[PDB]
Q: What sequence folds into this?
């Protein structure tokens, strides 16, 4: 395929779908995708927006499927 | 060889072969390859389609071999 | 989106917001972002400025959210 | 040197030499190299051909040395 | 910023500042930065100069801050 | 600096200096550098020549310093 990553992240950011972001160090982050660019995802929880490097993301698991 | 990755992923997706995706953190994901692009594989389980970064994939083990 | 990484790091560096930098090896660094470039972040604690490779950063968690 | 990787993998694939492929997660795969490209190695065991990402390979140890 | 990595490594090498180099596998290396290029740092201990791949470096912690 | 990696590996390969190659998975390989290219190092022990991906190498520690 071509260009599935961005439609997927765009859907998460616009629809505010709850996600679980699994990092290569075993940490699981939870919140909503605020925004993203070439290298990072901005993830907002109850307290803070944190900057997650895509290079450290293994998988992003939405609470429900997004349609692209 | 040249361009074996995409034929492999395409065969999995079009023939709906169940796979095991082993990640660099030891997690094993299971389901169907829905689609893929330069950097990600969309993997569907019982519940949802999740986005897996290729950079975190160690190996993809199909339930049966593809053509 | 496009070019969210640098506005985020710029805000941290100019406003000196305390951060927690989680590395791929599970180490958690704490201090303030002094400066950054394509590949590294300079993080200052009470004692020293250390040079952190972005490739080893999983997430950067500010003590409070920055506006970009 | 220049372009030793491909002659090495070509010898394994054409001569079907048994290999042990050590991954960055400590997993050890065993079988024969079926084929390879820029990013992946196709490794066949008794049951199945699996697709191994080179980025996850630490070392490939043949059962005997190949000449290139 | 732009091009802070090399000034940092150059200061360590020219001022002979002892460093701790933490690797992604948890190993901590100690000694002097001898030299560096696009991909590696040459680190000298008691005995030898070893070649460290930047891709395996998490952080470099100097014994004292550089200018 | 510029182009220190190859002079270092060339010295190891031509002078056959015993090395210890530490991998990101904690494995320590021992032997001599046979050859190398952009992406791999061919390391020979008593039994076999194995192909090591540079991306999985943390550090290469020679038994004695090489002069470049």
A:
């Amino acid at each position: 395929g071509q260009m599935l990553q961005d439609p997927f992240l765009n859907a998460l950011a616009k629809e505010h779908v709850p996600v679980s972001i699994y990092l290569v160090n075993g940490i699981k982050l939870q919140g909503q995708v605020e925004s993203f660019d070439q290298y990072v995802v901005l993830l907002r929880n109850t307290s803070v927006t944190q900057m997650v490097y895509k290079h450290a993301i293994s998988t992003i698991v939405p609470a429900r499927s997004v349609n692209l």
Q: What stands out?
A: Strands of chain D lie at 18-23, 28-36, 40-44, 49-53, 57-62. Chains D and E do not touch (no CB pair under 8 Å).
